[PDB]
Amino acid sequence: XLLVTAGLVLA
């Protein structure tokens, strides 16, 4: 995906 997380950053 294109996200905004911490911590991993996933698809």
Side-chain angles (χ1 to χ4, degrees):
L2 310 166
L3 289 156
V4 184
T5 87
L8 290 260
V9 179
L10 310 174

